[PDB]
Ligand binder design. Sequence first.
Ligand SMILES: O=C(Nc1ncnc2nc[nH]c12)c1cccc(-c2cccc(-n3cccc3)c2)c1
Ligand SMILES: O=C(Nc1ncnc2nc[nH]c12)c1cccc(-c2cccc(-n3cccc3)c2)c1
Ligand SMILES: [Mg+2]
Ligand SMILES: [Mg+2]
Ligand SMILES: [Mg+2]
Ligand SMILES: [Mg+2]
Lengths: 459, 454, 454, 459
Amino acid sequence: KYRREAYHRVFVNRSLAMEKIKCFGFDMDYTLAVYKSPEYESLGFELTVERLVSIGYPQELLSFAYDSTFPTRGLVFDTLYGNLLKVDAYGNLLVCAHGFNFIRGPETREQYPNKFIQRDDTERFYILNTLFNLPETYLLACLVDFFTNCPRYTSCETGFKDGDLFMSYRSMFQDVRDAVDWVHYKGSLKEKTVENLEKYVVKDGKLPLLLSRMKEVGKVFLATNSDYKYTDKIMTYLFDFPHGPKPGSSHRPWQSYFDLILVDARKPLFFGEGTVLRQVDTKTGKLKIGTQHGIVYSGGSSDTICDLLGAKGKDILYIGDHIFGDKKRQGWRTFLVIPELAQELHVWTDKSSLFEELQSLDIFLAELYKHLDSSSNERPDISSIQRRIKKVTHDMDMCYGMMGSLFRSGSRQTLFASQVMRYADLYAASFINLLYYPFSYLFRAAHVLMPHESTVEHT
Amino acid sequence: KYRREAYHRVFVNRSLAMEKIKCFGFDMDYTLAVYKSPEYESLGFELTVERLVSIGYPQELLSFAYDSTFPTRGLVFDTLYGNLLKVDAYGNLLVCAHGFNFIRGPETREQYPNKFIQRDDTERFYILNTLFNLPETYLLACLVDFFTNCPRYTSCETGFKDGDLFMSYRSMFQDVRDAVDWVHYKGSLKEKTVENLEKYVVKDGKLPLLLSRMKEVGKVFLATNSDYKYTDKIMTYLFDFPHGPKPGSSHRPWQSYFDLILVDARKPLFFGEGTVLRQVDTKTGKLKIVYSGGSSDTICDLLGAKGKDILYIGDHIFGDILKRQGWRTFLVIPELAQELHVWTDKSSLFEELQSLDIFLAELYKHLDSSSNERPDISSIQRRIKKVTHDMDMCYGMMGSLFRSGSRQTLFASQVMRYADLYAASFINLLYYPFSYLFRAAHVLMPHESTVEHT
Amino acid sequence: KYRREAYHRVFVNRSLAMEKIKCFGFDMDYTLAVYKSPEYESLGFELTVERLVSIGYPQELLSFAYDSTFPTRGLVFDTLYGNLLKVDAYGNLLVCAHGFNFIRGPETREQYPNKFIQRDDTERFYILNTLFNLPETYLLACLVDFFTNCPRYTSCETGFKDGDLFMSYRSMFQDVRDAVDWVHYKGSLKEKTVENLEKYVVKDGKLPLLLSRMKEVGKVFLATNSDYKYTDKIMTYLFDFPHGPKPGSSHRPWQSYFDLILVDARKPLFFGEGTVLRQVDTKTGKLKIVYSGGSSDTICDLLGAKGKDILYIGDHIFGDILKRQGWRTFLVIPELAQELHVWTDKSSLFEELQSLDIFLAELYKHLDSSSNERPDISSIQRRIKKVTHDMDMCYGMMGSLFRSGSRQTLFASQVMRYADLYAASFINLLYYPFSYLFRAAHVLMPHESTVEHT
Amino acid sequence: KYRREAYHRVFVNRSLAMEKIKCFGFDMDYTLAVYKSPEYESLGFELTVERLVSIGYPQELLSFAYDSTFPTRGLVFDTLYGNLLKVDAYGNLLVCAHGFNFIRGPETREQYPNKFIQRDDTERFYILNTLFNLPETYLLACLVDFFTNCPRYTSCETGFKDGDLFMSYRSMFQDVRDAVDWVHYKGSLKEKTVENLEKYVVKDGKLPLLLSRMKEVGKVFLATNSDYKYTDKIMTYLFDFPHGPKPGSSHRPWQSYFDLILVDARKPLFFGEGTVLRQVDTKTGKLKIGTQHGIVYSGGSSDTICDLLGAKGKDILYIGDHIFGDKKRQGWRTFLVIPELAQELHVWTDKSSLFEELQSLDIFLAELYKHLDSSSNERPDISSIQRRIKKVTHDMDMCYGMMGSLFRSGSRQTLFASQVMRYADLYAASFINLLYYPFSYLFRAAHVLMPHESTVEHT
Ligand SMILES: O=C(Nc1ncnc2nc[nH]c12)c1cccc(-c2cccc(-n3cccc3)c2)c1
Ligand SMILES: O=C(Nc1ncnc2nc[nH]c12)c1cccc(-c2cccc(-n3cccc3)c2)c1
Ligand SMILES: [Mg+2]
Ligand SMILES: [Mg+2]
Ligand SMILES: [Mg+2]
Ligand SMILES: [Mg+2]
């Protein structure tokens, strides 16, 4: 079968006939505006720590340096015991780190009977789903680690004797959860991003090319959480080239690429009741009191966008980096951006050696038990080649980072995997990969197989 | 790679070293006592209709004959609109039948906005999950079909009017839900089973052979909901052969094969705090070795094993957490036999879908977003639908237990949530040693299944 | 101030100028056809038990005799815990009875945290609002009492076990809810009523006198849910006197008293979009002046009146908004007769509570927050409870329709929401002219009722 | 029967045995801190208007002067048609003003079929329940009035052609709803309050006297929304006298009057899940990282307060100005402060003349129909004495303000009345009236009567 280059590919969960697509909707942040890594994370990290020190946290936090190789997106923070968990779709603990100490084996079972947690017990647990969470993911580990191994702090099961009244992990977590919020909303993050954009934000002439082609076969819109003056800056930079879509072409304003531009969207509330629809003054950012087609909207709702565009769910492909939830309404189609996927395809490809040795070691196992059944009392020693497995699974796991792959730990899918398969029709490392497909393309679901399907042939 | 004969195989969701397994636990009904099909379903049907009629339903119900080729296990009755729904893992409608009238495409979303139901709404939606539900699955659709297509009745969205008296589908359902219960508990289902077990229960010498081999390497217990007079009848029959485990040997009573036998389990309550531990007068068939009631916890205490040491073998999918560490599970799915026969004997269909997919790929290969080219594929897009429809109807009118085309079923997801192991019968354990290392087969995402390691 | 005899009086929630009233609309059942008490309730009871028994309930149900002194209208069946609750306007528990066992004080909040239920939870709580509910109000408590107090059964929180078969209170309730419906619609309640109307329906020459006087000053219509063969039977009997309106005059058929007669109303649906307008063959007693089905809107069109011009007289409390302007209402509350007799004949109790309250005031008069003085009042605090209990039991075992001591009932609040006027019977209109100005009596708050204008 | 002076009285909805009360809980704002009227309202009003002008509203708003005689607390703003409604418990329109124009009669019925509204249709309607709402209550009327009678604005059914793109009443309302919020939370209201406290806040030596007596018979606590530095200032001023509880006594700190002090309460969330319990640094306001009895708490929950005080709902009388809603939990008793009640008791008392003439005019009516029944065709003309009624009800109504009494319009109770009877065990113009009762007092419910109870004697 013909398949496009791995790194160009759009992966299909549910089938989608692209000619039926009439509108393309865009998330801005971490979608069109992909923030550079490790650098944007570091900026968030440093600003969050600066903010915690200012409210009374110890100075030793300033020596923390962000480390991209620790966090994996989507971990669960247990505010009761101060643990970052990696769990599967159903609640089962895959990985459990206290600070930088990885527990596993029997010792985890003392703290988590049945190696299981109630994911729907919010504000005991906290799911760190988004790309903005990577900083505080690593920070919490640092914090738990520091206070654990600092002699003037006594470690309790649910927190610390800090000096000496009590700081619970739950209080420490809110402390962190507020700092990040503060940094995004009142601190100098957006500010420092904007003042050196070439350091923090990616740009590629492929973005205007792709959008322009979309506007030829359908309508295009923007629905972002960010305000207008932040959006005007970020988009102006994304489209700053000495030309328009193609080389030689005249440069066009970034506004000219959208039939509808909406800011202050308030997602997820946007997709339900929403807020009241406003309009924005291009000249000032400040909202117009009252509410031609060169217009910029504020607030509003999903439903409104369809009414203005003259469309309906089915007709709309919504492109972004965020996984939502859940009717009625009317039910937009979905493209999901997962930047980690560029790294994971390199492991899947450039680390074949490991996958092959696993496959063969597994093969070999099947041979040992070939002429064997319940009658047979032969207990072939397999501890030797068991060991080589755990540990090549460890090595393979560790190519993805210290908390492993985004989508799986060994055999098991992660909770993050299941939600991606819930939420997304289409996915890839970036929407740009759309460039490589015609707009008449028929995306066929890549069928997912149960054991009795995957390992039984049609012969 | 070496793989045992498909019909003998034991499939693996999560890895399991069998040598670690110290006790083997057994469900009885539809595990050790596999009830014959279609005859046992039919009996439950007839008895349930006869009961309904006895409390005022029309005579025309008596000319209903159970039809095994309609019901697929795991469907959802929407008590609001009277529909039988086949949904996916997340609540997406795959299949909607009002009576025997299959609906959607356009006409669903009249009734189900975003072709979606929020699966957890208990008062409206009822998952027909068990093998004992197959009868009422068929009966329910029969009833709605009848009242729709009968001049005596006027049909509303939420029910039908029985001339001046409204009858909601929700109320119709609870009559059907009660009749079945009555028939199992107050009525003569259990009785008419026992009076001709040859017609109603499977038996095979493999079952005592297997349980004998298990008792050599571990402990073995029975944990059933049924009572003792019924259990003794059933277990006695299952073990009635002119010999013991192997040919030649003396026959032994069925009890001899179990270290612990427990009845009146009241699962799922069994698995939580349970009921008080009683024991049973073998003689009286009454209270008050043979235990009654009790707890999951109690079993562990008595057997002197706990948790990961226990392999629970049965036909029922449970839930929740397991404080207190929970058992490993082997799950019986009788439908799996027939479904493997489609997977192997209908390969000509699979291969053709494969060819049509290969072809599509080739039409679009030299094409990107620069291209204006609209290939017409509607011919291909048509045959793919007929083959995919044809393929689905090999499994019956409501399709496969585990999927509809693309999409997995909510059932499939429950199976993968709950079961370490699964097969059409537990008996297939016979073909593996007790030192075996069951290694989880491995469930790939699009980007894993459709790109290679080179 | 001049006020008519209490038993003749028509009470006013909202003001109403009668001269503005152009049409008078009538409910039939329990409005014009007041069914005799306790004999009609008993019949419904016996028929409903006999029906339950016919579908498998124990014989002991047949030795139940309906008892009018237990049920008070407006109680709430909690289908979860099997309790009959008397709550206030906002959902506060006033009275909790499991079977015939009255509960609270301490033991409620075991079951009802904050002695509170969220009244709008339809699937759990069922308001027994109508006069036809009185039978099943008593029956329900009987049933729970029986199954609790019977060695055959084991009682759980959510139900009782019928030996191996669980029976939830919720399932018990829907059996009871269905039996009543069956008895009204499929069974012989309507039939056994018609065969001896002398025993089962009140009649009085005042009814034709009143309706004749109404037709002089406005239009008059009938809007009932019952059919025509039943309506003709009932209306014919109500009007069977050897004369017309006044003594001396010729008798006239009952239809002659109405400008418009409508059956099969299907209220409340009647008041919304309704059903298609049919008319009835007087002869056949069948379709297809006498109308059938239709709409609230249609009545207005045909009568050429609309809304505030119409006074709807009935025994049923409705709801919602009324787009389209809605009618004014007169509400029949038969219980009001008996309740007025307590209010007048038991004045010795009221006066004594008044004296005990006066006394308490005097004990605390010279006292403020500066004072250390704890008067003991527990003797007084005791007798106030016995008199207040004694007073409440004058209205039956479940107290007044409208209140428990301090607190008003959710029923009282519905009455005040829905009804412009109310009385024990509509007949009391007879004592007012059609130029009358009904002026709303006036509902005071603590600071208005307990401080004076000087 | 003996009753205390009207203006000293605590009015009883549901009975309450005061000896059973073990803890007294306090709201601060508009409870202990009663803000002076008309002056605090004016300050809110001016700051809100200054804020609307700054974001683009016309300068003519600056000439608006707050007018205490217009608003009545608890009105409903219809964002669809721009109307302030006064409704009853069940939804029925009692009063309807577009700006300063009062509709009534037939004309209202065109816009509100059945003279009825769905109160549970939020963000069409908005209930202005709180004392902080009085400013924006009057403001909305002004705004609707101004734009209506300003020649360069065209009046639409749902808004205005302002200049000329559209400003809906719904957009104008949010505009207002944000200004007030902004003024409270980011603007100079708290600021300007604090800098001249004797102008804006009441003080009375009765407050320390009463509290001190409460601390002798039970425990006392504070649970306010305001922050610590705002609370420290407001309370310090409330207790600034040259003495403690009684004359001659030594002055004590305001902290010494509470066993538990809690700020940042986040009501109503406080009464459910709450937030995490923190502690505050008395020296800085800034929260302590970690968490003796001289302590000040932050955040937390209802449940926590009981645990710390060692009590349970039944035992706790909660005193404040706000009406909440609604289990489980554990169900505090309730004292509700309604400052308007001091004015309304003056009408009830000093305007008897009107009540008497009504009563007599009503008497006279009953005479006319005395010897009359359905037989009688006498239609006595009563239009003359009908008129004198509507209009003495109008005069009586108008003694309370242009939108009438807080608790009723003519015969009918307001929606505000019903909620007070829902929510409150005890009520009065101020909690201070507790001073006049012993702590052994038995408050007896003042029974509420239906027509057949109120106008039938026991003879
Ligand atoms: O996450 C991504 N984001 C980005 N990808 C492409 N365009 C982007 N505009 C903003 N963010 C984008 C990512 C994912 C995979 C490949 C890449 C990429 C990055 C740099 C250069 C290129 N490239 C150069 C020639 C062809 C492709 C490809 C980028
Ligand atoms: O809303 C009120 N609030 C206030 N009432 C009493 N003390 C307060 N501390 C803060 N706010 C209070 C109000 C309600 C009714 C009467 C009054 C009051 C006001 C001023 C002086 C007095 N007074 C003087 C002698 C006796 C009473 C009484 C006040
Ligand atoms: Mg984003
Ligand atoms: Mg079973
Ligand atoms: Mg009726
Ligand atoms: Mg307050």
